[PDB]
Design a protein around this ligand. Structure first.
Ligand SMILES: *[C@@H]1O[C@H](CO)[C@@H](O)[C@H](O)[C@H]1NC(C)=O
Lengths: 50, 50
């Protein structure tokens, strides 16, 4: 009696590798926050009047 | 870069205020007030304030 792995084996199937799409996490990103846009002005009427 | 160049500065001025007052029999009234911001000379900013 001999084991099943003692004889050479050939794959009769046509392998098809399937790599699922990895999960992705999106982080917040802004070129200019609303605070930066407000600060872009040279003068602010609110602060000047205050 | 939209942020304006921010730097610290010190202002020096005198609030010159000359008012005209009319004295009645039983009351006082301001016939005119002249407010002006007079600048401080370099000699005073250096030899007196600083
Ligand atoms: C992936 O597919 C290939 C054939 O494209 C196959 O040879 C391989 O054994 C499969 N599995 C792994 C883990 O690479």
């Amino acid at each position: 009696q001999l084991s099943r792995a003692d004889i050479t084996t050939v794959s009769t199937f046509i392998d098809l590798n399937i790599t699922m799409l990895e999960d992705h996490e999106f982080v917040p990103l802004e070129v200019y926050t609303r605070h930066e846009i407000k600060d872009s002005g040279l003068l602010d009427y609110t602060e000047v009047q205050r | 870069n939209i942020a304006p160049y921010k730097f610290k500065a010190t202002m020096y001025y005198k609030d010159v205020t000359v008012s005209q007052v009319w004295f009645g029999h039983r009351y006082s009234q301001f016939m005119g007030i002249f407010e002006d911001r007079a600048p401080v000379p370099f000699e005073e900013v250096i030899d007196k304030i600083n």
